[PDB]
Amino acid sequence: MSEYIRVTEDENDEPIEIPSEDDGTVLLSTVTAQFPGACGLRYRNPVEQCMRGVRLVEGILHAPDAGWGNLVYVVNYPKD
Amino acid sequence: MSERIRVTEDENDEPIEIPSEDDGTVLLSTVTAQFPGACGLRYRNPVSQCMRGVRLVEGILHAPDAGWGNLVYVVNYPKD
Known about the structure:
The structure holds two protein chains of two kinds. Chain A has one domain (about 1-80). Chain A contains one helix and eight strands, in the order βββαβββββ. Chain A has one helix spanning about 30-35, and strands spanning about 5-10, 15-20, 25, 40-45, 50-55, 55, 60, 75. In chain A, the strands form two sheets. In chain A, strands 2-1-8-4-5 form a five-stranded mixed beta sheet, covered by helices on one side. In chain A, a hairpin with a 4-residue loop joins β4 (about 40-45) and β5 (about 50-55). Chain B is mostly beta strands. In chain B, the strands form three sheets. Chain B has a three-stranded antiparallel beta sheet. A three-stranded antiparallel beta sheet of chain B has the order 5-4-8, with no helix packed on it. Chain B has a two-stranded antiparallel ribbon with strand order 1-2. Chains A and B meet through β2 and α1 of A and β4, β5 and β6 of B. Chains A, B: It is found in: Nucleus; Cytoplasm; Cytoplasm, Stress granule; Mitochondrion. Chains A, B: This is TAR DNA-binding protein 43.
């Protein structure tokens, strides 16, 4: 089954739901669809309450230990 | 023609329709053929009350297992 994630570009608005691949990874192109100019992904680990960045390779974001559907994610946005 | 997909950018006007492919895929060019530069698609997800986007890969949109009929609503628009 395809993993499911909930990202957010701006916390003042509503979060965005992203359908991931069955592989358990997320495709950056799906992010760029809703987020133009943006790339990358962040989240916070409930372990140390610190912000973290999701691993990316060739446009493919790699899920954490438990996967995607457990925490919230934030899309990396530049100043532009 | 194979499947058609309803989609709009603003609910004040009338939603348009784009021919999707039998493989559950839509071509970016077909979307931009309708919209003046729009990319990606999403909709009001009643499940999370957020905006759920659709899988995108190199300009090719990939429908979920259900298909396009459950996501036919709003098209995405980049800043460029």
